[model samples]
Target chain A: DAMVKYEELLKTLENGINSEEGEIRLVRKSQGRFKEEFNFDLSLGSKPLLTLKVFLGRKPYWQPWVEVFGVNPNLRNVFFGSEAERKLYEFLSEHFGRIFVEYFEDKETTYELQKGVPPALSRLGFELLKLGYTYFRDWFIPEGLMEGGHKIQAEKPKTEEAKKRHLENLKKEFEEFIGKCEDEGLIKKVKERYNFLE
Target chain B: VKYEELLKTLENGINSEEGEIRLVRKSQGRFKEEFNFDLSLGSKPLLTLKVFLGRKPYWQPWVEVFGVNPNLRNVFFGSEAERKLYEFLSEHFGRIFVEYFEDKETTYELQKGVPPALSRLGFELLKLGYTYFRDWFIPEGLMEGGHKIQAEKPKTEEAKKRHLENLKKEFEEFIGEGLIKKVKERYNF
Candidate 1:
């Protein structure tokens, strides 16, 4: 399928984020720019001072648009007249620090990561590099390939084993997608000393 | 800053901002452009109308008039031009969201924001651990009569008291309980 239905994508790839803040849910399309936008109400306790929005995007290489409420993209360059406004921007910056990742390999060994790595994926039993790009929590969505907007479809499957099998297949396909990306120049530097996971 | 002057700044600010809109192609995802009216009157900037991404105001194809203008003093208290500029913009582009005070913790909901007077108190409220958004950090009376009507009132009951005061409360408890000398000074006199 050229496009994975939005509903299935939610269940399989584009899952809800469970972070230190709480369970972040999927916002509707019109509510946000991208098809899959995970909206977070970031609070310093119970009082919400900011809204952290992360949505998947295609161009600029299958990345996430991590943004704060008071601060827009261009504010990155504009001078700040409002002191508190600048503070809010600074606060959001540290709150959503970029995620990093490091990979390891044993010639003859077996290890498996959980399906669709969630955003802010910590406690993963591995140490990633210090310098990294925007946080993806590095979901298994291949940064290489054809995928259109989220649509919808569903069918009852057999059992937990079958569901597990299904997810495993998706992971395999993602790995293969990466390999293909390397063969073609869809993605570059597949293996660097420190790799940034999408 | 006169109303006419403010108007002129905004007009030039958006149009003079010709090339920035092209930055839209640089969009990764949440693509937006900002047009700030950059002018200074003295040591401090008077009225700031930094148009953020999204809505296009009536005449402009560029961006919105909705943004932060920290110094309400310049607009209301300082001069005839300032209030007139604010008033005119309000009438034309609708109410812009502004962060008047300088609190690090900005409650940014259309309904909520940093407590107004919190910053002027200079985190004294934060240190004491209790301060209400009681009044203007700057003098509200400084504003002229008619222009005062244009101000955005505190919509939600955002009390900086609880979190801030709790810090003070704990310290007070520590000071009151920890270093005290409870002794019977029978022979002291």
Candidate 2:
């Protein structure tokens, strides 16, 4: 029952409240020295959102390690000491599914958020920005949250020059080139590389 | 200038130039990172031909035209007129190739399957006295050597089938057999 309650609280905070409104506390201690701290509030929705801290450190050329504090106690324990470490990491690999992070040994931690929202009580701080979400923009700017509800635009054309005049000129030039080659019968030897549907 | 004279000059000029000639090699690297693969003909000779024909359009992707070479800015994008030249070529011939050419003799010759409209356009450019084009538009000599080998002695059907099977097996090994179908769908192969 406590696990379900924790999961429910996480879901509500991640979706309803803005990231800035949620109470997120981040601390990084490097080389046995306190490096930095960051704080955010995600509690405007009147939910009991937890204040979480991230503990990270590393060794010489080491891959580095991270631990979450003041969130889901069981999750924090599973992450810090368990074979399910890979499973926990894999779950965060999806867009906004978890607070995707990269920690450079003794340097800094980079936060990534895209789509949906980060899982609750996981200390993965993401979501709640006015600009909505863009996969690329959010990737670069972790602080700015994407607008909650927005439609994605149609994909852009992959090639250059879609304008009428540009297409006309391109068509005319190529038409001439192909026409000339035809007159000289130079392409007689070239074979079609593939069969087309049309 | 006669076509033969133009061809000779081009042969001399291209052979003499010592600039690095790098062929654009396609691979799965971009596909893996960006999930998009490029299947376009982007060779030096083609770009040079577009420049010489005065058909290059302005709207063609900037990076593609000069690639990593900032030095090309002076020669290709220096003035409004120069930019206009690229624009013209890009607008007409930038995206697709209606027909491709192959070298038959020492000189580059036109292939069959010429549409009447295109043929008229070629004749118009020819009549305009752009004979220097004969030097190296469609390319010849060793440039077409690889294509020549494929054409002259084509692969057998069985060999092609076996190669295809081998490639499929390799792809399956690299990206799990279950994903082979999805990968093919993405590439439309």
Candidate 3:
């Protein structure tokens, strides 16, 4: 049942490619060298679906390296082999265009794991399910992917004048935008909904 | 601790929002007089419309809407100007969903809510081309450390099809514009 379901996911991904909906590429790790192979044409856009990173090492001949690639739009050169790759990808993709973190050192990265199934296979299963494929499952697990890369604390203004000037500039910018919105009657619509009169 | 002592503790807090200017008199404070009562939006979670009161209160609030810097124990806001914009939103909305405002410092979660004011605000901000967060495209190692970069674009039919479909659905759901228009204007949409 698991294998059949996985095959169906592969079919769905293929359909996505045919429909011009998404992409699925392959990154191979062989003999300690990384090679990325594209199964789809590049001109679509910068963003892409999660690509499979197959690591085939001679020592572990039968076992395939089932990692993920193209998860990070910024750093395309890197590949993530963490078992929690799927959950992280889902979390980031769901919150696309928002700020995210990638650790400078890969060893420090950690992820929340889904129960029963290993993350890599669970990710494959989830992708299939999202594509409207029907497959019977005993149970499903969803885990929260917390960002634990590193922390950077905000600093205070260097000078009082600088701080004051910053507020002044921001107020000017905010008011200008508000004025445009008001002209467009967008703000009025919001006011009406909120029952606020000015 | 007295308000003055508290002020000493909260020195130079960045103004994350500019709420309605109301001078409220506090009888229990050190000085019996009117002071600037302002609301602020902070960079961290669980902090929204934080109330501030005093004359020339040194409030320097920052929002984290960018990648984490390994060098610092806490994430930093890009600039004073950015933090001020965040504050401006806090002051205007007064009441906002934590889901929309939280994790701005590190994760920078997406805007999600049914609030018309927030939707309108987000829409207006997007239309105005306001830079709410720093671009993650440029990595610090590549810029400062001169690290080489290599990336290949997808070209196969399957990759393109899936990528486009995902983009369409994403644009439709998250973007309030109903549908993605003029893909060239957006970020590789």
Per-residue accuracy of model 2 over B46-156 as CA lDDT, tens digit each: 232211111122111111121223343333222333333323333332121111122222112222322111232222222222211111132335332112100001126
In candidate 3 the C-alpha lDDT for residue B122 amounts to 32
| lDDT over C-alpha atoms for residue A134 of model 2 | 16
lDDT of 3 by residue, B97-163 (tens): 2122212432222223222212322322333322221112224454421111111123366764664
lDDT of 3 at B131: 25
Q: Which 10 residues in a row give candidate 2 chain A its minimum summed lDDT?
A: A189-198
- Model 2 lDDT per residue over A57-143, tens place: 222332222221222322232233233323233322221211323211101011111211121101122111111111211223110
- How much lDDT does candidate 1 score? 0.30
Q: How would you encode candidate 1's per-residue C-alpha lDDT over A89-142 as one tens digit per residue?
A: 333233223321111111000012322222222222112111222222332311
Each prediction's whole-model lDDT (CA): 0.30, 0.25, 0.29
CAPRI quality band, candidate 2: incorrect
DockQ of 2: 0.01
Q: Who is ahead in DockQ, 1 or 2?
A: 1
